[PDB]
Amino acid sequence: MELPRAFGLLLHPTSLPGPYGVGVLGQEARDFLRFLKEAGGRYWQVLPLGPTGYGDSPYQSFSAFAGNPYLIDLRPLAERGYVRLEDPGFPQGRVDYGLLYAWKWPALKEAFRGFKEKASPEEREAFAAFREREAWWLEDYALFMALKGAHGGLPWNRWPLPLRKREEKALREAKSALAEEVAFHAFTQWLFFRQWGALKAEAEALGIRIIGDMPIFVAEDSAEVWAHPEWFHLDEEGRPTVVAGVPPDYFSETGQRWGNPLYRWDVLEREGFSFWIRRLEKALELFHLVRIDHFRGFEAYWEIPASCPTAVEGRWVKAPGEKLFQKIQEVFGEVPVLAEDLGVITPEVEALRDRFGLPGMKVLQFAFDXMENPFLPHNYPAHGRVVVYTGTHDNDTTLGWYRTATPHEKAFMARYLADWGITFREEEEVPWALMHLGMKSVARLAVYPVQDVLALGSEARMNYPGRPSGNWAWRLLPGELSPEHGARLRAMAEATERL
Numbered sequence: 021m022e023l024p025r026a027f028g029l030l031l032h033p034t035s036l037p038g039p040y041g042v043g044v045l046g047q048e049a050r051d052f053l054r055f056l057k058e059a060g061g062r063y064w065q066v067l068p069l070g071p072t073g074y075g076d077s078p079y080q081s082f083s084a085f086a087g088n089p090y091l092i093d094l095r096p097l098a099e100r101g102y103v104r105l106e107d108p109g110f111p112q113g114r115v116d117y118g119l120l121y122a123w124k125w126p127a128l129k130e131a132f133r134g135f136k137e138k139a140s141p142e143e144r145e146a147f148a149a150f151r152e153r154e155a156w157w158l159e160d161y162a163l164f165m166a167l168k169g170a171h172g173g174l175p176w177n178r179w180p181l182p183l184r185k186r187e188e189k190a191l192r193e194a195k196s197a198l199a200e201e202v203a204f205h206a207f208t209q210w211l212f213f214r215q216w217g218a219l220k221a222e223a224e225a226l227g228i229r230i231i232g233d234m235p236i237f238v239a240e241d242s243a244e245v246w247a248h249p250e251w252f253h254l255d256e257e258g259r260p261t262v263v264a265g266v267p268p269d270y271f272s273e274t275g276q277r278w279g280n281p282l283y284r285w286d287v288l289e290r291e292g293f294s295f296w297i298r299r300l301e302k303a304l305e306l307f308h309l310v311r312i313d314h315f316r317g318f319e320a321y322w323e324i325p326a327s328c329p330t331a332v333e334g335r336w337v338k339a340p341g342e343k344l345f346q347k348i349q350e351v352f353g354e355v356p357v358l359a360e361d362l363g364v365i366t367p368e369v370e371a372l373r374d375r376f377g378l379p380g381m382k383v384l385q386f387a388f389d390x391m392e393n394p395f396l397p398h399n400y401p402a403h404g405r406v407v408v409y410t411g412t413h414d415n416d417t418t419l420g421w422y423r424t425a426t427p428h429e430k431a432f433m434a435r436y437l438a439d440w441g442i443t444f445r446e447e448e449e450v451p452w453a454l455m456h457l458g459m460k461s462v463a464r465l466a467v468y469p470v471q472d473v474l475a476l477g478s479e480a481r482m483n484y485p486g487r488p489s490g491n492w493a494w495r496l497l498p499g500e501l502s503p504e505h506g507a508r509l510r511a512m513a514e515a516t517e518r519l
């Protein structure tokens with residue numbers, strides 16, 4: 021990939037303003053892309069776009085391939101008379117996922133029945149054609165979701181054995197009995213990918229590239245794990261014997277026990293890494309580049325015994341990252357991947373990243389707690405093949421972070437900024453001071469969360485890791501991101517050779 025010198029904004033589509041309880045792939049999404057282009061921005065970064073479960077996290081999806089039905093704009097379906105929409109009373113500035121769950125799933129199901137009643141033959145055949153095209157993952161995903169309604173929302177590895185173990189007759193009978201439910205889930209997928217495609221075409225017409233994201237590890241309770249248990253370290257009952265995480269750190273005392281199933285990489289290699297090829301293909305249908313979270317896991321991963329309640333016990337296990345990425349380069353002709361390389365990284369990880377020319381990340385909130393700090397701009401690679409952020413979706417807003425930062429951090433930050441000619445008078449100005457610093461740097465891409473453009477405090481934090489609740493909920497208000505915000509971003513980009 022060739023990275024131009026430019027800037028972008030980080031905004032998950034759920035955070036878009038608009039009616040009916042969550043950001044969707046419609047007019048407000050187009051309005052945001054127009055805002056971004058007029059601000060001089062060339063990149064729009066989102067988080068993973070798959071269907072979510074308990075905790076609402078984009079990084080723990082029911083499928084590695086599916087799209088999130090919550091992002092479906094219902095207004096076009098209402099225009100065709102498929103459904104009547106009535107706002108139940110959604111809050112301002114945040115997603116209420118309980119109310120969204122209770123109101124949007126039934127609205128989608130009503131819209132599906134309306135479509136079955138009133139759709140033209142053309143629409144019906146286009147929907148059937150989509151199903152045929154995507155069957156290699158969609159048949160499993162749709163049946164997986166349908167079976168949740170037959171089994172009280174249980175995960176797949178708690179279903180009756182004939183279904184859990186995917187016996188041929190059990191599946192055939194399930195598919196016939198749940199034909200309507202299967203079709204409904206296929207329908208949500210058809211709509212998602214249709215609406216995303218339209219939005220991607222609009223971005224492309226405006227000169228904007230979309231940066232997507234995926235977790236290296238998939239979710240325990242997902243259609244692909246169910247369909248391919250041999251690829252994972254599961255016991256005979258389909259439960260993980262070991263799980264993903266990271267060991268104790270400078271930051272974390274016990275580390276993080278993520279709980280994801282771990283790949284049997286030997287099995288994936290023997291199978292030709294088809295899972296990874298398909299995942300990247302699917303990513304590249306939606307995005308122009310894709311970040312992979314926990315990129316270091318391609319070189320080695322921390323294996324936690326499933327019986328351990330923390331991440332303290334375990335061992336590092338090597339993974340065939342070099343072989344995988346050689347195959348990717350060979351078969352795609354390029355590797356349009358961004359490496360999430362935060363936390364503790366080794367020379368082996370850096371070499372893998374650099375062998376394939378993958379841009380890494382830099383986070384300015386991490387730069388001020390100790391002049392050799394790699395997150396300080398003067399320490400960035402001479403080539404500048406990195407993406408600089410003030411913070412990611414995992415960090416507090418920059419104003420939130422500043423308000424809780426240590427005395428030594430605050431003092432060093434102020435002096436370092438002054439060394440770059442940047443000064444500020446009030447704490448609410450710190451987000452823009454740090455955005456300016458990132459734009460002055462050699463980093464090819466500077467990408468900022470929209471909360472920092474707005475200089476919002478901790479209430480607008482997208483995710484607080486560890487905390488299982490309150491996350492992924494921040495939304496823009498209508499008109500909050502103003503033309504003056506866009507003019508300020510454009511001025512900064514023009515001032516730093518990013519336009």
Ligand SMILES: *[C@@H]1O[C@H](CO)[C@@H](O[C@H]2O[C@H](C)[C@@H](N[C@H]3C=C(CO)[C@@H](O)[C@H](O)[C@H]3O)[C@H](O)[C@H]2O)[C@H](O)[C@H]1O
Pocket residue numbers: 075077079080235276277278279313314414483484485486487488
């Ligand atoms: C990179 O990937 C991270 C790991 O998935 C992601 O973390 C967010 O999303 C997770 C799904 C969420 N919960 C898991 C973490 C645990 C402890 O660390 C377990 O207790 C839970 O059972 C897991 O489901 C994380 O808390 C959340 O931070 C990052 O957002 C992403 O950038």
